[PDB]
Design a protein around this ligand. Structure first.
Ligand code: HEM
Ligand code: HEM
Ligand SMILES: Cc1cc(N)nc(CCc2cncc([C@@H](CN)Cc3cc(C)cc(N)n3)c2)c1
Ligand SMILES: Cc1cc(N)nc(CCc2cncc([C@@H](CN)Cc3cc(C)cc(N)n3)c2)c1
Ligand SMILES: C[C@H](O)[C@H](O)[C@H]1CNc2nc(N)[nH]c(=O)c2N1
Ligand SMILES: C[C@H](O)[C@H](O)[C@H]1CNc2nc(N)[nH]c(=O)c2N1
Ligand SMILES: [Zn+2]
Lengths: 407, 411
């Protein structure tokens, strides 16, 4: 019930006590570990509010104070009466920053306290949503000098009036299945693109078409908006040594921005809360470019490199993977767009974990996600034991809205 | 109940019912997942149900469940337990149990091979000298001049825990590590403590970078004794690279036979505390972990220097570049010497076909994703994208504490 984690490279042992405050369930039991599974009213609301306000007032050294008691007081009266409550600005910013601090799959949490929070709780239409998201995108992009941000739309009320961004990230490329049988563009986005054409988008039918946003205000049917083209910073991918690389015609966008998660703070649920930081190079160069079900380019790059593709044991895939990843990092750095390589990011995460252990008594961390998808054991996180558990405030996965929406 | 796992690359979904047979615990709870934690004297009482569970599995596997033969065997074991407090396995039961401990080993990517395992029954062994002879014969049979064959040698079971057989080596073949007064290490830093024990026990250390360690063997709870494996039985591979002619001059070599000797084999509640087992290497074990871990031979620097990579910024990915070349070299070397080895692409692809077969015929395949995914290039292997359920089935292999921590020295 007080637990140790050991680093097997360095022999450092840390004691975790923060897990005792874990709220939600993990999916695991005493009999089965589900560590690799991607997706494992008034009465309930008052304890969630209390738990949250206690942690808030504690964080500002005023736990137990008259101002603490008066606030539980007020939120209590407000729930009783209105059956929900409204967070104060300060509470909303604290909640959002802690939802990131608590994101156990996120390697970049050393940054967690430097998060610009945009309060869009006064938004009422999808046009208003579109405006807020363009401003978020412009602020966060900052001409390539990226800054972390979140934009928080109104909280769920009765569940019939949800705000949702239908897109999974604010910026993604379209996918279209061909007469050919194959797929042009990103195969991850084929279903979403169909909904877009079906809601009226005029698809340019190219390999790298930025999808339009599909926004849902107050439970209405979602509407389509194109992000101003000049606000989507993209990077053409070249290689520092291979002049033929540019000829593949690859590009990626600078801003990773998740838009389908649910932010939960003191029992309140913010179903549209797009957030963004900056990329770790492997995300584009290993996953986006090299997954077999994504742009799947390994074979072309290997062929251009003239490697022996006859046998798996020449490690042609591995060789080409490294080159692709050198090209991503080089292209972002040349164009001065913030990016971090997986060595430097995971080293920061170990420093972060030590800080959180020391100052907070723990850091929930999901090893399956924190260890990079290439070169795992040459990053320090591979060697680091991690305990995974769920603290609130949190970001939660929620089902695709086209499955929920009644039109 | 049914549990589902999905492959995110293929959309294949599998349904697991086998987890309903697990009883041992995971370390996890509804509140904490310990899936990345490395490590998360029995009464007649507990023993008969364990024996019964095993014999029932064994008899079902031979299509004789509930037979007279089955009922007779239960009766026999039952009487033996209450008369002598333990029992002895038949040879057929021992073979079945050892094959199943491998099939159940959720951290093992090589399990497509589980039903091909040569079992050496060393239960008539009584002394450390006899253990040495048996382990030499295992080495020679398993090596097979480079055409490696899986095998396991099983020493007598635990009785009161005061008479245990133990191999003190963590693997049958490993290199010595010596800590120098300046704080540097010569040879394999993973084996420094064990090397010091050997030297203390009277081993005359060559003090080179690749000295094969002597066996340190404990029979019947006695003080352990040192033995050197005949060097002609230790097959080694000098490591060279197919295009880089300077790679040979790094002076690297490795041994061909990976042979775990510190684990405990549990079969129907009996504990085999000395049960060395061996297969063949996946290239990354040597080329990623043994050579490139910072706490092991740690050669990335020197390799990238010779490749003249840009080393001033990690973002040149120099470490990744040198990593791939080292791994090509390990595989090229073993292949060129006709020593069995498997690359991580072939091995994971075979593993996925084994896992799907297991789901169809057995209702599941417990698998530890943290260990199954290779330590380089994880997501270009198909296991990265495969959801896995980890749970504990018996017969099984378990970790045990190192014997120098628990041994009562007789002197
Ligand atoms: C600032 C730089 C950041 C870096 C380098 C970074 C790094 C990453 C990486 C590599 C992942 C895994 C993504 C994947 O495999 O698809 C991730 C996941 C995540 N990060 Fe971050 N992060 C950053 C900022 C943020 C911010 C600003 C937030 C929230 C405010 C956030 C919350 C999350 C969440 C919730 C996940 C899990 C996403 C999912 O389940 O799909 N991160 N982080
Ligand atoms: C035949 C070829 C085999 C291959 C290619 C193979 C592959 C591997 C690999 C790569 C690991 C991880 C090793 C590590 O990270 O240190 C491993 C773990 C393991 N394998 Fe195998 N395996 C093989 C045969 C065997 C055999 C014959 C047995 C037992 C009869 C066995 C039982 C295990 C066990 C118990 C582990 C976990 C080891 C531990 O916790 O340290 N495997 N397997
Ligand atoms: C804020 C942020 C920063 C940063 N550097 N990178 C990101 C990546 C976000 C992301 C981009 N594409 C895909 C994803 C995937 C999981 N790889 C989304 C996903 C899918 C599924 C099935 C489950 C789940 N929890 N998450 C996530 C976000
Ligand atoms: C039979 C077999 C086949 C094959 N291809 N490879 C092997 C390798 C075995 C091995 C070699 N060095 C080191 C190990 C380590 C864990 N990396 C032993 C270990 C350490 C710790 C702390 C825990 C644990 N369960 N196991 C295991 C064995
Ligand atoms: C099945 C497995 O959980 C799934 O492939 C995971 C593995 N680790 C991951 N790690 C990160 N960072 N992102 C991911 O999408 C995944 N996918
Ligand atoms: C802390 C973490 O569990 C540890 O480094 C693990 C990760 N995965 C591994 N996987 C294999 N095959 N062998 C190992 O030693 C490890 N070590
Ligand atoms: Zn778990």
């Amino acid at each position: 019930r007080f637990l140790k984690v050991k680093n097997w490279e360095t022999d450092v042992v840390l004691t975790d006590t923060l897990h005792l405050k874990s709220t939600l369930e993990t999916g695991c039991t005493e009999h089965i570990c589900m560590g690799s599974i991607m997706l494992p009213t008034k009465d309930q609301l008052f304890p969630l509010a209390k738990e949250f306000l206690d942690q808030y007032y504690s964080s500002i050294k005023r736990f137990g104070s008259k101002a603490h008691m008066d606030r539980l007081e007020e939120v209590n009266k407000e729930i009783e009466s209105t059956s929900t409550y409204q967070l104060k600005d300060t509470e909303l910013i604290y909640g959002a920053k802690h939802a990131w601090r608590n994101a156990s799959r996120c390697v970049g949490r050393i940054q967690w306290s430097k998060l610009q929070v945009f309060d869009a709780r006064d938004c009422t239409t999808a046009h208003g949503m579109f405006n807020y998201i363009c401003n978020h995108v412009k602020y966060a992009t900052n001409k390539g000098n990226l800054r972390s941000a979140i934009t928080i739309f109104p909280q769920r009320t009765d569940g019939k009036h949800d705000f949702r961004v239908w897109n999974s990230q604010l910026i993604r490329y379209a996918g279209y299945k061909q007469p050919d049988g194959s797929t042009l563009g990103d195969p991850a986005n084929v279903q979403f693109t169909e909904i877009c054409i079906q809601q009226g988008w005029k698809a340019p039918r190219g390999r790298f078409d930025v999808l339009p946003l599909l926004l849902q205000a107050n439970g209405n049917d979602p509407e389509l908006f194109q992000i101003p083209p000049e606000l989507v910073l993209e990077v053409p991918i070249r290689h520092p040594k291979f002049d033929w690389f540019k000829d593949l015609g690859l590009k990626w966008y600078g801003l990773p921005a998740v838009s389908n998660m649910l932010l939960e703070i003191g029992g309140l649920e913010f179903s549209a809360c797009p957030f963004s930081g900056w990329y770790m190079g492997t995300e584009i160069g290993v996953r986006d470019y090299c997954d077999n079900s994504r742009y799947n380019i390994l074979e072309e790059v290997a062929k251009k490199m003239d490697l022996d593709m006859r046998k798996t044991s020449s490690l042609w895939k591995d060789q080409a993977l490294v080159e692709i990843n050198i090209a991503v990092l080089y292209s972002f750095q040349s164009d001065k767009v913030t990016i971090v390589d997986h060595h430097s990011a995971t080293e920061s995460f170990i420093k972060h974990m030590e800080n959180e252990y020391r100052c907070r008594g723990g850091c929930p961390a999901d090893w399956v996600w924190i260890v990079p998808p290439m070169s795992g054991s040459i990053t320090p996180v591979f060697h680091q034991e991690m305990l995974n558990y769920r603290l609130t405030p949190s970001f939660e996965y929620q089902p695709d809205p086209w499955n929920t929406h009644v039109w």
